[PDB]
Amino acid sequence: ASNQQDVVKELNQQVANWTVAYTKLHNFHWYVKGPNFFSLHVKFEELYNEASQYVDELAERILAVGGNPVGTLTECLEQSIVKEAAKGYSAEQMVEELSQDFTNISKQLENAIEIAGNAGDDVSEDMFIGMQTSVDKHNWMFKSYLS
Amino acid sequence: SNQQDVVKELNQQVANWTVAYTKLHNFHWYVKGPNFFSLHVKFEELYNEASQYVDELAERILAVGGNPVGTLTECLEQSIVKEAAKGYSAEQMVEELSQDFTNISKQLENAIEIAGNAGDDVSEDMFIGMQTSVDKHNWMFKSYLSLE
Amino acid sequence: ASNQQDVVKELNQQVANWTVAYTKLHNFHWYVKGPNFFSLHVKFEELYNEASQYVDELAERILAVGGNPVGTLTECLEQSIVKEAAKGYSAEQMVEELSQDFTNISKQLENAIEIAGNAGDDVSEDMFIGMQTSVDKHNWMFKSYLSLE
Amino acid sequence: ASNQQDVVKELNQQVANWTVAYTKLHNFHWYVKGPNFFSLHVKFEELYNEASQYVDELAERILAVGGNPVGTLTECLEQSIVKEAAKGYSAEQMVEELSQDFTNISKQLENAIEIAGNAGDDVSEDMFIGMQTSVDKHNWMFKSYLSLE
Amino acid sequence: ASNQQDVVKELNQQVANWTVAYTKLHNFHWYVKGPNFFSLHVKFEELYNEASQYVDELAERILAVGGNPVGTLTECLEQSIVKEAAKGYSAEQMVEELSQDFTNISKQLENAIEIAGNAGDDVSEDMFIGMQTSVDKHNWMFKSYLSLE
Amino acid sequence: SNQQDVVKELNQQVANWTVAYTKLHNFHWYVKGPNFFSLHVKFEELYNEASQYVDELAERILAVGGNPVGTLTECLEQSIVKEAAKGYSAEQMVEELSQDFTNISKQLENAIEIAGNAGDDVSEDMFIGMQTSVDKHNWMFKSYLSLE
Amino acid sequence: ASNQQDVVKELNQQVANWTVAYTKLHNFHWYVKGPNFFSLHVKFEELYNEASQYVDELAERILAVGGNPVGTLTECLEQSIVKEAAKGYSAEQMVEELSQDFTNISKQLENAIEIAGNAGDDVSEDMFIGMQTSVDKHNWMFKSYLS
Amino acid sequence: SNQQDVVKELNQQVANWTVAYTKLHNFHWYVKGPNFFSLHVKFEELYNEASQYVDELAERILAVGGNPVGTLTECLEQSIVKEAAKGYSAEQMVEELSQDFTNISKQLENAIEIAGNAGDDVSEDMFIGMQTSVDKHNWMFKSYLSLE
Amino acid sequence: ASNQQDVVKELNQQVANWTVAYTKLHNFHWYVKGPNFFSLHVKFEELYNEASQYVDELAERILAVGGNPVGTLTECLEQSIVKEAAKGYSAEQMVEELSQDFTNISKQLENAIEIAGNAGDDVSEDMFIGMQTSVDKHNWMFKSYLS
Amino acid sequence: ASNQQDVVKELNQQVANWTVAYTKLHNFHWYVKGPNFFSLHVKFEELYNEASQYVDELAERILAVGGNPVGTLTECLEQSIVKEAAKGYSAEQMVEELSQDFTNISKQLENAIEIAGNAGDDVSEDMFIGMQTSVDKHNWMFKSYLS
Amino acid sequence: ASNQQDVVKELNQQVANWTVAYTKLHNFHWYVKGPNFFSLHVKFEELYNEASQYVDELAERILAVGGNPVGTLTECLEQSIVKEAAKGYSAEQMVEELSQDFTNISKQLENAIEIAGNAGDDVSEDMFIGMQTSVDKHNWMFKSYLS
Amino acid sequence: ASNQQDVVKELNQQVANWTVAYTKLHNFHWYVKGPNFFSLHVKFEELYNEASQYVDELAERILAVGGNPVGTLTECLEQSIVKEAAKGYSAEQMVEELSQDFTNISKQLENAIEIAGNAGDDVSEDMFIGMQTSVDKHNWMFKSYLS
Secondary structure: OOOHHHHHHHHHHHHHHHHHHHHHHHHHHHHOOOOOHHHHHHHHHHHHHHHHHHHHHHHHHHHHOOOOOOOOHHHHHHHOOOOOOOOOOOHHHHHHHHHHHHHHHHHHHHHHHHHHHHHOOHHHHHHHHHHHHHHHHHHHHHHHHHO | OOHHHHHHHHHHHHHHHHHHHHHHHHHHHHOOOOOHHHHHHHHHHHHHHHHHHHHHHHHHHHHOOOOOOOOHHHHHHHOOOOOOOOOOOHHHHHHHHHHHHHHHHHHHHHHHHHHHHHOOHHHHHHHHHHHHHHHHHHHHHHHHHOOO | OOOHHHHHHHHHHHHHHHHHHHHHHHHHHHHOOOOOHHHHHHHHHHHHHHHHHHHHHHHHHHHHOOOOOOOOHHHHHHHOOOOOOOOOOOHHHHHHHHHHHHHHHHHHHHHHHHHHHHHOOHHHHHHHHHHHHHHHHHHHHHHHHHOOO | OOOHHHHHHHHHHHHHHHHHHHHHHHHHHHHOOOOOHHHHHHHHHHHHHHHHHHHHHHHHHHHHOOOOOOOOHHHHHHHOOOOOOOOOOOHHHHHHHHHHHHHHHHHHHHHHHHHHHHHOOHHHHHHHHHHHHHHHHHHHHHHHHHOOO | OOOHHHHHHHHHHHHHHHHHHHHHHHHHHHHOOOOOHHHHHHHHHHHHHHHHHHHHHHHHHHHHOOOOOOOOHHHHHHHOOOOOOOOOOOHHHHHHHHHHHHHHHHHHHHHHHHHHHHHOOHHHHHHHHHHHHHHHHHHHHHHHHHOOO | OOHHHHHHHHHHHHHHHHHHHHHHHHHHHHOOOOOHHHHHHHHHHHHHHHHHHHHHHHHHHHHOOOOOOOOHHHHHHHOOOOOOOOOOOHHHHHHHHHHHHHHHHHHHHHHHHHHHHHOOHHHHHHHHHHHHHHHHHHHHHHHHHOOO | OOOHHHHHHHHHHHHHHHHHHHHHHHHHHHHOOOOOHHHHHHHHHHHHHHHHHHHHHHHHHHHHOOOOOOOOHHHHHHHOOOOOOOOOOOHHHHHHHHHHHHHHHHHHHHHHHHHHHHHOOHHHHHHHHHHHHHHHHHHHHHHHHHO | OOHHHHHHHHHHHHHHHHHHHHHHHHHHHHOOOOOHHHHHHHHHHHHHHHHHHHHHHHHHHHHOOOOOOOOHHHHHHHOOOOOOOOOOOHHHHHHHHHHHHHHHHHHHHHHHHHHHHHOOHHHHHHHHHHHHHHHHHHHHHHHHHOOO | OOOHHHHHHHHHHHHHHHHHHHHHHHHHHHHOOOOOHHHHHHHHHHHHHHHHHHHHHHHHHHHHOOOOOOOOHHHHHHHOOOOOOOOOOOHHHHHHHHHHHHHHHHHHHHHHHHHHHHHOOHHHHHHHHHHHHHHHHHHHHHHHHHO | OOHHHHHHHHHHHHHHHHHHHHHHHHHHHHHOOOOOHHHHHHHHHHHHHHHHHHHHHHHHHHHHOOOOOOOOHHHHHHHOOOOOOOOOOOHHHHHHHHHHHHHHHHHHHHHHHHHHHHOOOHHHHHHHHHHHHHHHHHHHHHHHHOO | OOHHHHHHHHHHHHHHHHHHHHHHHHHHHHHOOOOOHHHHHHHHHHHHHHHHHHHHHHHHHHHHOOOOOOOOHHHHHHHOOOOOOOOOOOHHHHHHHHHHHHHHHHHHHHHHHHHHHHOOOHHHHHHHHHHHHHHHHHHHHHHHHOO | OOHHHHHHHHHHHHHHHHHHHHHHHHHHHHHOOOOOHHHHHHHHHHHHHHHHHHHHHHHHHHHHOOOOOOOOHHHHHHHOOOOOOOOOOOHHHHHHHHHHHHHHHHHHHHHHHHHHHHOOOHHHHHHHHHHHHHHHHHHHHHHHHOO
């Protein structure tokens, strides 16, 4: 079975993931090179803007259920399954890594949705579903770019 | 649970928010103190949100062939939200809204279960959307009330 | 010689009328049926949105003159000359009733305007005038919609 | 135990339904006649604009789960439960048919929602819910427009 | 072989028609009655706003070719093929008359277009085309509204 | 004064502004001189304002059960505003508009008194609103005309 | 009885009042301190923006009736019943003073409305009524803040 | 040429663009490669433009007393635009759209002549407007396809 | 008779005219003096903004028919019938010259429209008609300003 | 006597100048007459709105550096090099006076910029530069209007 | 060791400071409590949005001068003089800490401005000035809030 | 020979550069081809719109300091270090040339900034800084596009 604290853990996992992703997306936004610079430069910004929205939405949901949203970078770095950007990525490698991150995040969300549903936290469940919706959509786009 | 059970839950909220709509106007008008400007506006944002819920849930009832409660007398009879009493401080207004939102969120948890079991996933989704906002506002109310 | 208190009474009478009308308009907005559904469904919403504006305007004026705006539905139902919706109304019957309500309100406003002016409350007087302007305009539209042929 | 493939089938069923409906709504938008012309002419456009949004949303979800969205009109006509417009429909008959279509679609969506949930595709499930919400709402309006008196 | 002067005559004919129509549309906008009041009340306003745009466009074109735009109501009433509103028109009769006016104007425009082109005034020709486009479109809507059943 | 007396005053303005609407178009088209750009636009702003008055006052007449003048022939018969003559300088156009606005403002002062005495406070308010704009524009016209 | 010149005097009294109030509101906007700084800082700006609108509206009405709007600070300082801001006001004292100013102005307006009406200047009368409407509304808010 | 000949030309385009509307959705969904983001959006802009043409030309047919093709079966029977096949590269999608636009522009040149000769200057103007956009887009397609 | 290349020549003639006019309008926008400075200063900007739109519209039409739009100032200066601005123009002289330029351009457009129509290039024909529409309208305004 | 205090002095000089100018511009806005009425009437309003922006910006900067922004009309009239409007100007005289005021202000700003830079108050220096940019631009327009 | 490299160092110091501040401001935005909740909750969001703008602006300037913008949270935490949020602050303590951070940042900016100017990097200098302008303005507000 | 006249020289150099660039950017906007057509086609338009803004801003500043802004294409071609477009470039070559132009312009601006500052023309200096900021930013993007 699952309880409210289990959902808070799932919520914080995402706050952590997207806080790290927010910076990695800035890194990619700044360092991307090649013929597709203009498209990707903007696409990465659209993505980190969406990431910041998710961070705030999930963090305030944690507050709404009486929990503590991870509020330090040190904590986010410890929990996040999204790793910081290495050095020297080509445009292709950046999209490939983001695609893997989104694949991993979507998988975590499938589990988070089940946990929330079983805990009776339908609000958090709905938030995870909305996030998975956009994550899966963007991932399809990444894979198409890479095809 | 069946469709009529869900209609009962939908009307329960139409009633709650119709009463809350006027109570929020009351608080909007009578609020006093150094936080007057912030709360005067906050209460208006809340009653605008309340009117949206009333129309949304009422039209969902219509969409499933039911009759939305359309008189104040009926809303007063079904609402778990009380009308404003006489004389409140800003602190007391936010405390009461917190009580109301806590009560409504609890009622919604059950409504969600009933809608889901009846196969009314649309109404279920509407209740979830409402509970989302209700819980968010409640956190804000409790934060405002915290002793500094 | 009317006084401020007399004006507050007139202001609350309208707060009550429009609070009741606000919900009656939702009722008509939801229950209207027939070939004119789309137009009326929308028109009734425009009307209750306008009703809410009146309720707030007049209530805050009462506050501006040191009075107490009626803050409960129970009190509104007691003072309102606008009665709650009954069951089984056709679109035509809904418009007919709103027209009668608007005719009644406009008449009350004529008296309220006189009272406010006599009391020297020119601000409340102006608010009643603004309301009567819209009420009469809408009533002409209702009567036109209801005209035979 | 439904699987992803079963959900894609449900998603394409709707892509097909709404692609056909998109054109049927243009037909009604163009051929509607009578005293309610102005309201219906516009309402039908709002409906096909909404239909186009559904087609794209569901098609891109199918892509997001690795499937193939039906990309031809021929295929859509084959799967769609929504049939093309016939000749000589009055405004009332148009609304009656759309109501029947919406009733049929809502029923299909109830099943699609169950399939998606059982398969663990909560995103597609949510999309079907959103669609059913609007379909049911519009249907209530159609039925109200069609009500006698 | 038409000349610029012939085109100015065609331009003023329309300035006159639409100036008269501008007021006739206000009349219909004010006097329309019946269950279609809300839709028609608005439609007639959209039409006179469009009429005002035509009057200014064509008048300033006449200026652009060195001519004199008819600048008085008396002159407009003299040239206009659009007659002023009579009393006691039902909504249906109003739409019927506007349809006849639009049919008459479209026919005049067909000739005006030919005259402009023959005179080498391709700008005025284009303006007449734009006007005929809208006139014909509106006329189809009027005729659809008027269709029986 | 009674309601019909007020309707007469309302129609008087519907007539005035319907004629002024076309005269302003005339001035809008025929204005010439170094101030062409400013006046060409100013006259358009004025006729747009004129159309608003016509519709507002006409619908007030409808709201009191009267018949708004709906033909140009009738407007020409009741208007105290003359149609544009042939040949004006920019200075002459503004001078005539000033004359018209002065005349209308005077007519409105009486209309306001009539409406008030008849108990038609709504029409009175509409006349006041119009007089407000009319007087403001007239000051601007006179300023433009002042010798530098 | 009252005449047009009497109304012009009433109009100029307000142009003067609000010209001085415009600056006092800036002073309060700049010097307000305390926990309510953010709300009051903005509220005072909204008020001086409204004040500037009144100054222009009433001044141009004076022009419309053939009068001369007070156009110098020296003149406004001589006529205004609104006094310039002292030094060291607390947030509470600022609202208290504005409330007194609005009370005084509303009282002047009641008289100005009567004067204008008796002079047959219904346009100016209407302008005074519109001003009194907002002045009374804001005063209610000030008193509520102070309650 | 007569009015019915023009209606035939108008319906030919309603058919073409109704099929193109769905093919553009197809390309919008299936496009892949490093230019995915630019083309994904470009194709959407194109189908939105396509829907505008369909409604415009269909209502022109109505305006001349004709019957606009209102079923997919009829559009497929009259369209010179083929439905998307299975499997395209980004380059192949743009190449096919270029072929379609070249074909449509040629068809429009004739439609324009027919409309003009029939005295249907309104339909002629609509065809010209469409050809304007079609030719502009085609230049862009060819530019995208140029070997670097 | 006329062919597609003849139309391209007409299109380039206008691209050239308006490219030169764009700069002359800036010159007038900057150097205009006198009591009407504010009106003309803005009017000239509105005109060069419209000029830039025409340049792009006609140039891309040339591309659409397979031609080469004049893309250098040297070429535009060689083809343009609009001459660069002299020195010391009064406001009146500026409007007078623009009026003459518009008269000349409208005359060229009448011929360009005939050429395009005879070549079967109805799209280009329509573009010339739209340009002549605005050119004639603006010229009427110039003449009225000068009357 | 400190450098920063000298900068505050320069900031207050401008708060004073523009507070007085704010009212003088209303005066000109109301009393301007002649064939250029419509243009100047609006131009003067655009100028006082701009002036109000300066007063607030500079006043709050003074606050940002721990100083006291002049918050009374009495004080402003004492420090301002901009004098109140005299009686009955012609439109030409109004523009001539504003041009002289702008010339005087720009000269003061040149000094203020050097004082701010010398004191290391680069923020205030930047604000003075921004003001001088607009002042000089408007002055060029005034001179052009005056021929 | 070059002057331009010293400027990049100054630019990265700020990218680091604001990246950390971005998250600390989210923390305060989420955890703030008390009667001033509504005002501070929004104020802190306005501040982190502003912070995100700085990070991108400065990061891309570093790129414009051929440098490497710090693109990892790990790096930012090392260089930032802004420390992560501690446990359970009162609203007053949150504002007090931000005020100290802003005071520290403004002091760093004063130096960065001189370094940039000395290196002839006037673009970076201007960016630092822009940042200092807002930082100082916000700090004045924080201090006013704290009395 | 005066310092201010040297600044006018620097201002005109840029008015000339950007007037020529305005047309070269239209050329590239029209003739660009290849898979990056859509991105570059729009990017080049954004650049010429920006260029038009510079020409007007700098031209009117020259006017603000009593100078004569170059108002003829003939003059611009003579002073501009930006050369007109050659025949048939590849997309890559277009970006390479713009990058070199931007590098050359930025270098000129560095000098112009020092000249303006030395002459005490801080307004012109600020304008040059603003231009250099955008030029350098665009150049970083061009270089990134080129790998």
